[PDB]
Design a protein around this ligand. Sequence first.
Ligand SMILES: CC(C)CCC[C@@H](C)[C@H]1CC[C@H]2[C@@H]3CC=C4C[C@@H](OC(=O)CCC(=O)O)CC[C@]4(C)[C@H]3CC[C@]12C
Ligand SMILES: CC(C)CCC[C@@H](C)[C@H]1CC[C@H]2[C@@H]3CC=C4C[C@@H](OC(=O)CCC(=O)O)CC[C@]4(C)[C@H]3CC[C@]12C
Ligand SMILES: FC(F)(F)c1ccccc1-c1cc(C(F)(F)F)c2[nH]c(C3=NOC4(CCCCC4)C3)nc2c1
Ligand SMILES: FC(F)(F)c1ccccc1-c1cc(C(F)(F)F)c2[nH]c(C3=NOC4(CCCCC4)C3)nc2c1
Ligand SMILES: CCCCCCCCCCC
Ligand SMILES: CCCCCCCCCCC
Ligand SMILES: CCCCCCCCCCC
Ligand code: NA
Ligand code: NA
Lengths: 857, 284, 49, 49
Amino acid sequence: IQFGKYIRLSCDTDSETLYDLMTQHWHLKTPNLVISVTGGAKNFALKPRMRKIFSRLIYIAQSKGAWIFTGGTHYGLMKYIGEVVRDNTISRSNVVAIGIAAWGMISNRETLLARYIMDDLKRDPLYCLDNNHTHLLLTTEAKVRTQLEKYISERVIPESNYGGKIPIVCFAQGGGKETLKSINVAIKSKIPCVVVEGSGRIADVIASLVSSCVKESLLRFLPRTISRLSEEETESWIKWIKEVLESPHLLTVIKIEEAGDEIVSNAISFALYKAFSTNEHDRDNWNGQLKLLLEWNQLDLASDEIFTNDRNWESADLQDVMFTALVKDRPKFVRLFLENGLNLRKFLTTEVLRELYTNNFSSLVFKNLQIAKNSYNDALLTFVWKMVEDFRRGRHPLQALFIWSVLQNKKELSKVIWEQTRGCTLAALGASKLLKSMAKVKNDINAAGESEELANEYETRAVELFTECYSNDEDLAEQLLTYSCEAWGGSNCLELAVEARDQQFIAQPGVQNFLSKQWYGEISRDTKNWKIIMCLFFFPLIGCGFISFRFLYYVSFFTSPFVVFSWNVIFYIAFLLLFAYVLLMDFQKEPTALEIILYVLVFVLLCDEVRQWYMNGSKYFSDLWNVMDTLAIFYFIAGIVFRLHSDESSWYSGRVIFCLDYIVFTLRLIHIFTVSRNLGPKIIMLQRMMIDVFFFLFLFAVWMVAFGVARQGILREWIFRSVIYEPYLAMFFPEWITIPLVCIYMLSTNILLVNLLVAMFGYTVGNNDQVWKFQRFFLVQEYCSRLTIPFPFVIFAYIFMVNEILAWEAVMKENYLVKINTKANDSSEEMVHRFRQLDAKLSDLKGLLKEISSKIK
Amino acid sequence: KNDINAAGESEELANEYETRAVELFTECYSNDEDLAEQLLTYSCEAWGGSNCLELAVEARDQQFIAQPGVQNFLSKQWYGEISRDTKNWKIIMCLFFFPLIGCGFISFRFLYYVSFFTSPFVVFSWNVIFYIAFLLLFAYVLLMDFQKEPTALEIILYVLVFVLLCDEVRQWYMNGSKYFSDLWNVMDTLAIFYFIAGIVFRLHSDESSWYSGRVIFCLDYIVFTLRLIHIFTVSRNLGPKIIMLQRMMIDVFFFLFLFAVWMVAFGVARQGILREWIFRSVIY
Amino acid sequence: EAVMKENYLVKINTKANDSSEEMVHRFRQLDAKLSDLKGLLKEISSKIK
Amino acid sequence: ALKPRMRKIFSRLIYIAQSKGAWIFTGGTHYGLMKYIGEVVRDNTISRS
Ligand SMILES: CC(C)CCC[C@@H](C)[C@H]1CC[C@H]2[C@@H]3CC=C4C[C@@H](OC(=O)CCC(=O)O)CC[C@]4(C)[C@H]3CC[C@]12C
Ligand SMILES: CC(C)CCC[C@@H](C)[C@H]1CC[C@H]2[C@@H]3CC=C4C[C@@H](OC(=O)CCC(=O)O)CC[C@]4(C)[C@H]3CC[C@]12C
Ligand SMILES: FC(F)(F)c1ccccc1-c1cc(C(F)(F)F)c2[nH]c(C3=NOC4(CCCCC4)C3)nc2c1
Ligand SMILES: FC(F)(F)c1ccccc1-c1cc(C(F)(F)F)c2[nH]c(C3=NOC4(CCCCC4)C3)nc2c1
Ligand SMILES: CCCCCCCCCCC
Ligand SMILES: CCCCCCCCCCC
Ligand SMILES: CCCCCCCCCCC
Ligand code: NA
Ligand code: NA
């Protein structure tokens, strides 16, 4: 059909190959089958509540793969049911909406792509077919429908998730004789369950009953119906409601009090559970009721009615029930199976994990791994992309599952498996490092936008766990920082927080105190600053009772990074005073013995820095001031070979290279003074302003070159020696050209002035205690890594080179996990549980008012 | 401003409908990016004859434009058919090296070469590289060449500013006299008009005019470099400093105006204390 | 875009449950439950007198 | 059924038992509560309260 399939049928059709028509020449079979009953009511109060209930129903029908049996006409609900079906195929979350019509009640007919005319819906009582139903089969209709549902309820499937039985549910709302008749043929012919609602005429007369008091409530909800149909038909209606309350287990109500989601999936699953439970051929079966309550998300029904200690499972049979709890993303059920006993390390064999990374790893996330591994590479990503490829080509098993959940952005499933890991403040940072690598991938903003926040949730979990760890024992938490992880990724928690730029983990007072312990070395804090400095100039004051080291005292003093840095600054000044004494009073013609001292004092400055050409990765060359140090030392060695040339034009030029080298050796000392003073909140203002003036001095040099072309082009390989140098030395005819020449200077200034003022203020635009404390931790960490031995005795170390904490961290996790849930009492402060806790207390008053009218009548 | 109460409630109803367009497009972008970006450039069958993207930038709808769906669409537009996540230097090294495009080196998501050289990231990086090579040729001609006649290297410079001229009278379309209130884009015409005025002073055969033709070219070298400095200072401060820039840049144009007004009044006090000549002495 | 509007319009109203968190509907939902107790206390003094 | 509520009640109990210096008489087998009761005891000796 074209406004879709069509089949003409009379009522006495065939023997069940109508279903085999639907599955052999046609679409797939069913794990679920909802039917809808509203009749040909042209009026339908389409409330936004009714819009949610019948949009969740189509969403559930594609979440399970169901058919929907409706009258296939273009009126009200069954028109709206079709529109949510085409809304679902457009949104692409398929769903099959099979329409059941009379063939005698339709408007037009075309017999053979057939064309149908949706002309207009006037006063003619014939019905208009609906345009959005995927299949159409054509109160004539209510036997071929009811015999089909009485077939497929008995159709035994070999898959058999719901005792075989192809789960049927009858979704009912609204009034009319036809919807009250169809609930009867639902319950009484065979027994599929029925769901009713809290709005409608016939829907509320059965919702009120969960006698002639039937008819009392019946004229409450539909009084203008009784005035037309007969009293020999009013007697049948009270009779009809009597055969639906004979089976009160096959009825679930959607009460108006449920003002939220879950409510359509709660009602269908509860109705499917009773029709599984009250069958009683299944009450001994705890396992079929588990997979039924796990395919749906009924956590509370599984906790109350399957794990009771009246049923006796023994938790070793719970293996395949756990695997489907993982791959369907049921985070409440993987938590329920560990709470009721499951050794998750025993369950996670290596072929289960390769069953998870092959079949259950999504190809979109695996596509974003290649855009992460090849474009934004790290030491962790090369480990994890290797670890994914080992499983896909077919030992810490709890972290292979944890990486699997974290990669797929499974937000609540990964937090269940994180509480089972052993190194769990390291798995939280290892997830935060991994997710921040996936958040760099700009192939999808929605995937990267949720891996970015899942990284911030796991950074906050590592903060709150380590704050719990540091508050209990400092010396144990600092062993937990530097734990070498047995190849988690081959990193500490401290390394893995600084690659990820995890500023909240690094700015916390436990980590910042660990670095101050590292920088002071074996010298304690609280001594004083000047108390350590005066022990530098005075050796026997160390052995005196003067510092607090918490001989072996002298080696602990002179290997602390505070002392080594203070020595390397004091020796650098004494190097500069010797470099100034040689350059002025000495330096006659030959390399004097005091200058030979300077030749080895820069060689130990050179070997210290090609040592920093290890731990290198060409990170060192993007530091913008550390490249000055090589080019100060390379300019020194170039000034040595000009000294050993015996020409007075070259010897003097060898001195000039040394005198210009004295400034960059002092500019390094000025740079050391300006960073060590502004270590503190100004280190963000510094080094961002310092790259901002390098851009302004670059643009000033570009303008100074262009000023040279305008200068030399106005006047008369010589050009490079005159277009570059003389504009700086000049800062050391009028045709009418001053009409633009001051407008040159009014445009030269206001592009160099603005670039200067951007440099002063550009640090402000674009948390600033955490932004600082990461960088203060960053800079101090490299010097504590920079060979904490005195500088002239660095060569004597350079050429001489040529799990009970995890048990302790596990008990700190349990104290941390309690402190989350006991703080979620302001969430339980609300009237959620508090509302009908006392309506239970007046139902007890109702339960004792049962006793009163029992004997007064 | 005929009624503040009517205009004060149409202002908030505009902010309610801008927020409705934000939350709907954030719903649209979170479901399918490729469908939401077709929804941006939908030509509306004459709603007003506009996209959602045009209609948000005329209205200065900053909340619709600052959302991550629209900002990602522009970064898709600026990178062109070249994907993101390649690297910055990975695209630059394919400018100097043509066969590195055909190699497995960028990620374009021959037809690869036309998709490379029509992306706005590459065209802008080419137009900066060619602008520097224009300035080095303009410096080589102005110093070593430029003897008396228009040398063949200088004829190259005469057409390289003509393609700079025709590119910009092309920007005298899409124009509305919007282009003339940009305060630095009017420098570019007056750099090119000052160039063409420096051409007709070269073809005059007088040594007082030929030398003055060179002076006009040498003063024109700075505004061609001040444009390059302006290109560098905007492309670096693309980021949160672009509000600090271009508001500070009009603030120094006011200060240099008031400095020039004081420098004129200092000239009257200077020349009035000492002994058509006045305009050549009170200003310069 | 029309089906993305319907998903957006639901997310407005399902987020207006903190507005429905108040005791507006919650106040006499249980006073209805004690009026049912009043409605069955209709039955008691009907026959003691 | 080791609920998180049951986890709090039998972790406070071991915490009370060291806050007072008590003995805890349990069946000494490796099943459920008496397995968990042992684990909070070794959790308490590790945490050293
Ligand atoms: C006349 C000359 C030869 C003798 C003067 C001695 C100073 C040049 C020396 C001795 C004390 C030194 C200072 C000792 C303590 C300070 C603060 C100190 O602060 C920190 O540790 C940074 C805080 C942090 O890392 O978290 C860093 C070294 C510094 C700048 C040192 C810089 C150079 C100083 C001033
Ligand atoms: C010695 C000369 C002849 C060769 C030096 C080459 C540079 C002059 C060229 C090649 C790389 C170019 C850059 C390539 C990438 C950057 C950053 C790029 O950043 C953006 O795309 C802005 C962000 C945004 O629009 O959202 C803008 C172009 C820019 C400044 C280009 C400016 C000029 C550059 C430095
Ligand atoms: F001081 C400082 F920045 F506040 C600082 C403060 C706190 C901790 C460490 C440092 C620091 C940082 C660096 C840098 F980050 F820059 F690498 C340093 N570099 C040197 C040099 N000593 O010899 C050299 C100088 C002479 C030429 C050869 C190399 C380098 N000392 C440093 C101390
Ligand atoms: F670079 C820039 F601003 F950071 C920028 C960054 C990002 C995107 C675009 C631009 C940009 C903006 C403009 C402006 F907004 F100013 F129009 C540009 N104008 C030019 C010129 N090329 O030739 C001309 C120079 C020589 C004289 C004739 C005209 C103009 N390039 C631009 C690039
Ligand atoms: C921040 C304390 C700085 C004290 C410097 C003391 C200098 C001692 C010099 C001894 C010769
Ligand atoms: C050609 C001179 C134009 C006026 C220069 C004033 C600039 C003052 C800058 C102070 C930072
Ligand atoms: C922001 C990345 C800038 C990289 C510039 C690379 C320059 C390549 C020059 C090749 C001759
Ligand atoms: Na200037
Ligand atoms: Na200036």
